[PDB]
Design a protein around this ligand. Structure first.
Ligand SMILES: CC[C@@]1(O)C[C@H](O[C@H]2C[C@H](N(C)C)[C@H](O)[C@H](C)O2)c2c(cc3c(c2O)C(=O)c2c(O)cccc2C3=O)[C@H]1C(=O)OC
Ligand SMILES: CC[C@@]1(O)C[C@H](O[C@H]2C[C@H](N(C)C)[C@H](O)[C@H](C)O2)c2c(cc3c(c2O)C(=O)c2c(O)cccc2C3=O)[C@H]1C(=O)OC
Ligand SMILES: C[S@+](CC[C@H](N)C(=O)[O-])C[C@H]1O[C@@H](n2cnc3c(N)ncnc32)[C@H](O)[C@@H]1O
Ligand SMILES: C[S@+](CC[C@H](N)C(=O)[O-])C[C@H]1O[C@@H](n2cnc3c(N)ncnc32)[C@H](O)[C@@H]1O
Lengths: 328, 313
């Protein structure tokens, strides 16, 4: 009974997320240990903040003066795992997680619930909210060293990174190759700034546009890193087809995502990837795909999976893959 | 890191609550172990139900899928009633969505339920007979035994009549009537609830000893009594409202009468009161002040939870 109640408790994660959002652990580490000072710094009502703190003590994140535990220290804004931002309700991902309150609808329909809560589908909501666009892009350790090392660039003149975020993958590849990042409004500006500040602006450019439209140029390698999981099969096939049509002769499409058999691993990795797969369902109608589902998606786009390079890791983000696709 | 991610995960409790809402474990126990059959019984999309099942396996509620010993606690007939307490169509798990706006409650000290559902808690139940009934059944889910200890924490020898103010389905009045055959009692409750209290007390064979009045415990109470009961009532109310209720009870005491308040690290219950109702759990010193504002004094406290016995000051 205690196990079930713990698994089912909605209050504990919302208390953690509220503490992250209020930056409570940052304020304590900066010398606000008392409720009166912490209530001033967080702009909260002191009696209610103490009731929040009581739960944070009960679950082991805090211990009239309060300090973080070793686990609570991970909510410090400068901790390398960045768990404060990933739990911050004002930033894109924990905000999107509220969509899980309508999880029954998503299981009933297979369709995302984010629009029903926030008024627009995911990327269109970000397009109207520059703060959320920027926090989404910053949330997504630019992590691309191993996938860049898993491909032979000898015969590659130009790389097109489709949906390439702030440009970290293109940069890892750059470190004879030139590259282009294709991205959405807003994101293109932070990609350009990142690439300039890496000293790579003469090797990597950035184009604003829509990867459902004809791609801006041809390339020898076209990258889809954590893109296709955001889309249902029919959209994923459209993106793959745009990429296929943009390949130079002998070119390849590189997919950087999860591509395992549905077995193996541990309950810990099972859980971690269950969360990602369910986030794609609820936020976007997308999904993680097994190695076998990749074969079918590829065939619908006129492609074949030529090779799957394993990118192992026993710790988060665990084992990933680089799939290499060629025209069929 | 793993501990923090587990504590912070909204996904797992919503997967549990979705399984409870879909009555998934009941359908498995009733023969549907495969996704095709379970999708049909739950009226869900099979590929998405499988993704839900994968999470339920990873967290150890399921393991052709069958419930684990923990998952079996989501059977609808299990006496701890955890399926209904996690059911998003019933009152409490529905109210728990208020926690998605917990930062607002911490900022203001005010409930977030009305901002989500359009009306404050008891007004919403008053317009939704299904939610009113499921709330009453959730709290009364063990009322045949849960009031034996508070009833035995008080001596009924010189009590003639009991008034249970906000008495739910009547379980406390019934436990007192079984403890003390000489007492009569009255339950005061809201619309809807009074009908299921009347039915419960009739089916206990107590209808000649316990009656039920529909009314509002912020108004003059319907009669006087030697013992007036407030069981898990005052925690629903901010201080000024709790004082009003206590004062109405004080006005209705017979000479020599007493008010009985029936009310681990509880932070969940306290935060639920904040977000649902603006209420709170109270420590002893706070009870002393509330009592004093209503013209009362705390005469004795019995550990059971507690039973506080209040007398006119
Ligand atoms: C923490 C691991 C990872 O960063 C992997 C994964 O993180 C990315 C970036 C990450 N970063 C260090 C650049 C790293 O390269 C990793 C291998 O890939 C990932 C994550 C999360 C999301 C997403 C992720 O791709 C999303 O794509 C995503 C999205 O496209 C739309 C909405 C939400 C999300 C995500 O929440 C993360 C994840 O799997 O969390 C369980
Ligand atoms: C699970 C423990 C408990 O049943 C204690 C507590 O439940 C106890 C006492 C309760 N009572 C009728 C004696 C009953 O016997 C139940 C099975 O166990 C409790 C609970 C929950 C509520 C409430 C609780 O009292 C409420 O009163 C309540 C309310 O008045 C209005 C809105 C919501 C609620 C509640 O959600 C529960 C709780 O503390 O959850 C954290
Ligand atoms: C940030 S995630 C993956 C980013 C990056 N490739 C990585 O691995 O971290 C998916 C990206 O697809 C982009 N995107 C979504 N729809 C798009 C579209 N129609 N055209 C171009 N980019 C799009 C989003 O802006 C987002 O940055
Ligand atoms: C169910 S909880 C506690 C019930 C019961 N005494 C117990 O211990 O389980 C609080 C009760 O207060 C009742 N209540 C709320 N506002 C009321 C009001 N103004 N007048 C009478 N009853 C009210 C609700 O209907 C609800 O049943």
């Amino acid at each position: 009974l205690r196990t079930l109640i713990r698994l089912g408790s909605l209050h504990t994660p919302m208390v953690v997320r509220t503490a992250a959002t209020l930056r409570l652990v940052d304020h304590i580490l900066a010398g606000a240990r008392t409720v009166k000072a912490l209530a001033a710094r967080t702009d909260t009502r002191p009696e209610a903040l103490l009731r929040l703190i009581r739960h944070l003590v009960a679950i082991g994140l805090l211990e009239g003066e309060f300090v973080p535990t070793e686990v609570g220290e991970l909510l410090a804004d400068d901790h390398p795992a960045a768990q404060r931002a990933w739990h911050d309700l004002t930033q894109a991902v924990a905000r999107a997680d509220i969509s899980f309150t309508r999880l029954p609808d998503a299981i009933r329909t297979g369709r995302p619930t984010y629009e029903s809560i926030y008024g627009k589908p995911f990327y269109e909501d970000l397009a109207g909210r520059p703060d959320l666009r920027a926090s989404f892009d910053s949330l997504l350790d630019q992590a691309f060293d191993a996938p860049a090392a898993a491909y032979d660039w000898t015969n590659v003149r130009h790389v097109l990174d489709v949906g390439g975020g702030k440009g970290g993958f293109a940069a890892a590849i750059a470190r004879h190759v030139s590259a282009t990042v294709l991205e959405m409004a807003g994101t293109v500006d932070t990609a350009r700034s990142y690439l300039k500040d890496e000293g790579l602006s003469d090797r990597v450019d950035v184009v604003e546009g829509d990867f459902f439209e004809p791609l801006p140029r041809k390339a020898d390698a076209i990258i889809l890193s954590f893109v296709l999981l955001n889309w249902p099969d029919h959209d994923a096939v459209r993106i793959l087809t745009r990429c296929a049509e943009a390949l130079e002769p002998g070119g390849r499409i590189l997919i950087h995502e999860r591509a395992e058999a549905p077995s193996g691993g541990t309950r810990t990795s099972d859980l971690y990837f269950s969360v990602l797969d369910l986030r794609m369902l609820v936020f976007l109608g997308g999904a993680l795909r097994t190695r076998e589902k990749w074969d079918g998606l590829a065939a619908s786009a006129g492609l074949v999976v030529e090779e799957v390079r394993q990118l192992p890791s026993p710790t988060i983000p665990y084992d990933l893959s680089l799939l290499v696709l060629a025209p069929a």
